[PDB]
């Protein structure tokens, strides 16, 4: 790997975003985190009330404007705001060549499951009802919002909505119980995620619901008619299992699902792409593969 991951690596082991001893020191932490990328002078972010969540229009010189990401930010269902991801979703405005929304979906420990599918799909609805393409359209996320993204087509699915042409999980998170083998066996090269932070963040949102819920854990949902799926995610996580569990699941169920563990990166490594090689290596394929199911 490049030089620069071991700077992001010693950032992270300071840094320790999932352990600080309160939500809202967490909440704070990776705001303060995030607050470092310099945001580019060419991004307009444009608020809007996406059908009842709040959300914000991200649009770069070359965005198409016909083209959409709904972007589901990480943060264990419990962190993570549009300013802790509008970099991350800027940047893949930019490799998409599309606008992207946003969205503050409700968080737990204040509001568990379903309220974050609840608005991921309530969201989807109102950009189809204010006149965007599914064949246009993808939904991607990180982490926790890498499983919300699973679970929001499900949903989607089960309600006869027509679902978008692609969709991108970086590192999902879709085991709330943390019983991968690399939850183990990378325990020692993951800088960020371990099953204590996991474990306590998965009871926030699953305020005592069985931790396979489907919607909450899409590892236990029925994937059957997801449209194509790009998982990206590192080799030194904790959460590698849960990607590879996924694409195993998902290519059982008959989806076009594309795996892509990129070797010793870390979680959401392409959030740290202003000084990582490979995270912006990393977006430009996320465009790559968005722009080609929108051909
Ligand atoms: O970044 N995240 O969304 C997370 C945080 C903790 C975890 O166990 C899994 C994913």
Same mark, same amino acid.
């Given at each position: 790997?490049?030089?620069?991951?071991?700077?992001?690596?010693? #950032?992270?082991?300071?840094?320790?975003?999932? &352990?600080?001893?309160?939500? %809202?020191?967490?909440?704070?932490? $990776?705001?303060?985190?995030?607050?470092?990328?310099?945001?580019?002078?060419?991004?307009? $972010?444009?608020?809007?009330?996406?059908?009842?969540?709040?959300? =914000?229009?991200?649009?770069?010189?070359?965005?198409?404007?016909?083209?959409? *990401? #709904?972007?589901?930010?990480?943060?264990?269902?419990?962190?993570?705001? /549009?300013?802790? !991801?509008?970099? $991350?979703?800027?940047?893949?405005?930019?490799?998409?060549?599309?606008?992207?929304?946003?969205? +503050?979906?409700?968080?737990?420990?204040? !509001?568990? !499951?379903?309220? =974050?599918?609840? @608005?991921?799909?309530?969201?989807?609805?109102?950009?189809?009802?204010?006149?965007?393409?599914?064949?246009?359209?993808?939904?991607?996320?990180?982490?926790?919002?890498?499983?919300?993204?699973?679970?929001?087509?499900?949903?989607?699915? @089960?309600?006869?909505?027509?679902?978008?042409?692609?969709?991108?999980?970086?590192?999902?998170?879709?085991?709330?119980?943390?019983?991968?083998?690399?939850?183990?066996?990378?325990?020692?090269?993951?800088?960020?995620?371990?099953?204590?932070? #996991? $474990?306590?963040?998965?009871?926030?949102? #699953?305020?005592? &619901? +069985?931790?396979?819920?489907?919607?909450?854990?899409?590892?236990?949902? +029925?994937?059957?008619?997801?449209?194509?799926?790009?998982?990206?995610?590192?080799?030194?996580?904790?959460?590698?299992?849960?990607?590879?569990?996924?694409?195993?699941?998902?290519?059982?169920?008959?989806?076009? *699902?594309?795996?892509?563990?990129? %070797?010793?990166? /870390? !979680?959401?490594? &392409?959030?740290?792409?202003?000084?990582?090689?490979?995270?912006?290596?990393? /977006?430009?394929?996320?465009?790559?593969?968005?722009?080609?199911?929108?051909?």
């Amino acid at each position: 790997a490049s030089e620069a991951l071991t700077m992001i690596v010693n #950032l992270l082991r300071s840094q320790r975003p999932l &352990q600080e001893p309160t939500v %809202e020191q967490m909440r704070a932490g $990776l705001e303060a985190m995030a607050q470092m990328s310099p945001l580019p002078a060419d991004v307009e $972010l444009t608020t809007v009330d996406a059908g009842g969540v709040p959300g =914000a229009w991200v649009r770069v010189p070359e965005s198409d404007p016909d083209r959409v *990401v #709904l972007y589901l930010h990480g943060g264990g269902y419990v962190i993570g705001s /549009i300013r802790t !991801h509008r970099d $991350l979703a800027q940047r893949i405005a930019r490799a998409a060549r599309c606008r992207v929304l946003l969205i +503050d979906y409700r968080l737990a420990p204040e !509001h568990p !499951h379903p309220a =974050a599918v609840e @608005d991921s799909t309530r969201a989807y609805r109102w950009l189809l009802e204010t006149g965007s393409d599914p064949k246009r359209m993808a939904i991607a996320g990180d982490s926790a919002g890498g499983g919300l993204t699973v679970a929001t087509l499900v949903a989607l699915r @089960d309600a006869g909505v027509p679902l978008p042409a692609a969709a991108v999980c970086l590192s999902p998170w879709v085991d709330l119980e943390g019983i991968g083998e690399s939850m183990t066996t990378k325990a020692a090269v993951d800088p960020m995620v371990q099953r204590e932070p #996991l $474990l306590r963040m998965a009871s926030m949102y #699953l305020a005592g &619901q +069985d931790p396979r819920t489907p919607l909450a854990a899409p590892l236990y949902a +029925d994937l059957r008619g997801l449209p194509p799926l790009l998982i990206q995610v590192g080799t030194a996580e904790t959460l590698l299992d849960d990607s590879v569990r996924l694409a195993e699941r998902a290519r059982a169920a008959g989806v076009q *699902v594309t795996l892509e563990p990129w %070797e010793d990166m /870390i !979680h959401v490594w &392409q959030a740290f792409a202003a000084m990582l090689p490979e995270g912006q290596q990393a /977006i430009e394929r996320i465009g790559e593969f968005l722009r080609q199911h929108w051909q």
